[PDB]
Design an enzyme around this catalytic site. Structure first.
Site, PDB file in Angstrom:
ATOM      1  CD  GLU A 141      -2.921  -1.301   2.202  1.00 43.18           C
ATOM      2  OE1 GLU A 141      -2.834  -0.510   3.171  1.00 43.18           O
ATOM      3  OE2 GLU A 141      -3.635  -2.329   2.229  1.00 43.18           O
ATOM      4  CG  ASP A 184      -2.991  -3.758  -4.813  1.00 40.09           C
ATOM      5  OD1 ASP A 184      -3.633  -2.917  -4.140  1.00 40.09           O
ATOM      6  OD2 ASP A 184      -3.537  -4.682  -5.440  1.00 40.09           O
ATOM      7  CD  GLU A 235      -2.665  -1.523  -8.323  1.00 37.12           C
ATOM      8  OE1 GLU A 235      -3.671  -1.607  -9.053  1.00 37.12           O
ATOM      9  OE2 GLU A 235      -2.669  -0.850  -7.273  1.00 37.12           O
ATOM     10  CG  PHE A 236      -2.685 -10.522  -8.824  1.00 40.59           C
ATOM     11  CD1 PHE A 236      -3.975 -10.757  -9.259  1.00 40.59           C
ATOM     12  CD2 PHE A 236      -1.865 -11.617  -8.589  1.00 40.59           C
ATOM     13  CE1 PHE A 236      -4.450 -12.056  -9.436  1.00 40.59           C
ATOM     14  CE2 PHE A 236      -2.326 -12.918  -8.763  1.00 40.59           C
ATOM     15  CZ  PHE A 236      -3.615 -13.140  -9.185  1.00 40.59           C
ATOM     16  CD  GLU A 237      -5.194  -4.700 -12.471  1.00 40.42           C
ATOM     17  OE1 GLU A 237      -6.309  -4.327 -12.026  1.00 40.42           O
ATOM     18  OE2 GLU A 237      -4.137  -4.068 -12.289  1.00 40.42           O
TER      19      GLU A 237
END
Lengths: 200, 200
Positions: free
Chosen positions: A77, A81, A98-100
């Protein structure tokens, strides 16, 4: 899990080929996404292929972020992410990923969020992970896929950006289903899964 | 209705200042967004301010697109919502525009859709219309607003892009509410509204 498709801009290629520590962050991401196995007792990732949309995807993201956090010392964060921060040649460098797990509109918002972080110099490289269509078919309804966002990878040209499309190694109706939701798996369950992944 | 905020990239500024017909398409868009009035008997646009999220926004978009289509000869669906096509100096030129009625993730997808159309030379100028936050507060729950997308206008730099934020002229609890949904107003009702707008 396998990395089946991958898009890397020319600027990411140059950056990887000349920055060891950035090359390392990238290697850690590829490893954390290749490492998931299923069931937890197995050494490959087999996805239950009974019906369309039967498996959850959030537990996979949690596992991935946990390996990066616990094993690779990434932070969670920044609102990116996960990111890795480190000093290299007297400069602070950051990699964001970021993992969508959301729909296509979500993926656009995520890509743009990283693109702006890059423009403002808040991160030096951006990476997005998405399941390929073939896998996504058996993942939860919401989830978008690599091929759906593909026509737009072109918008990242000019910036260091990498998109990775992952796939399961096998599809079988004889393994359990991956639970859906944020609470599909407790942290205790993700950590137990992580240990199996790492043989502990 | 009033245009209260507006973002125009340097490339759109140059293009407007040297291309008459593009300048015209832009003028027609500004006029179609300033023209809405409410109630239909009135000459200003007054929005009912009883509660947050009480009014629909789709009827406004339909009215706007109808003026452009009927009065200005714009086409609908290219999948850019509306666009104007015309030959100028032996070249086909296209202007594309979208009026955002979805959430912020939607707005990102819309912006990127236009950005890619621009990169591929499918359109020469892109325009996005969005209500400002103040108005959006009384519009339907889904709808995003100009200020929410603002931090990202920067991503369009380098391309001819214009963002317009509109506002109602007055806020009063003594006018009727604008109906919600795609079917909030029939085409007969939108066309009747359009005539009042145009005095017919």
């Amino acid at each position: 899990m396998e990395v089946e498709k991958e898009f890397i801009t020319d600027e990411a290629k140059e950056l990887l080929s000349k920055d060891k520590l950035i090359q390392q962050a990238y290697n850690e991401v590829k490893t954390s996404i290749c490492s998931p196995i299923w069931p937890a007792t197995s050494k490959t990732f087999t996805i239950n292929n009974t019906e369309k949309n039967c498996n959850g995807v959030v537990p996979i993201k949690e596992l991935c972020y946990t390996l990066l956090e616990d094993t690779y010392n990434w932070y969670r964060e920044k609102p990116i992410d996960v990111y890795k921060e480190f000093i290299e040649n007297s400069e602070l460098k950051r990699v964001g990923m970021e993992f969508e797990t959301g729909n296509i509109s979500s993926a656009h918002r995520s890509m743009n969020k990283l693109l702006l972080g890059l423009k403002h110099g808040e991160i030096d490289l951006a990476i997005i992970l998405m399941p390929i269509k073939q896998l996504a078919y058996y993942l939860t309804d919401r989830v978008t896929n690599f091929e759906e966002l593909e026509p737009y990878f072109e918008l990242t040209e000019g910036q260091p950006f990498i998109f990775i499309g992952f796939n399961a190694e096998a599809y079988n109706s004889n393994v359990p289903l991956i639970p859906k939701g944020s609470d599909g798996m407790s942290k205790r369950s993700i950590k137990k899964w992580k240990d199996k992944v790492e043989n502990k």
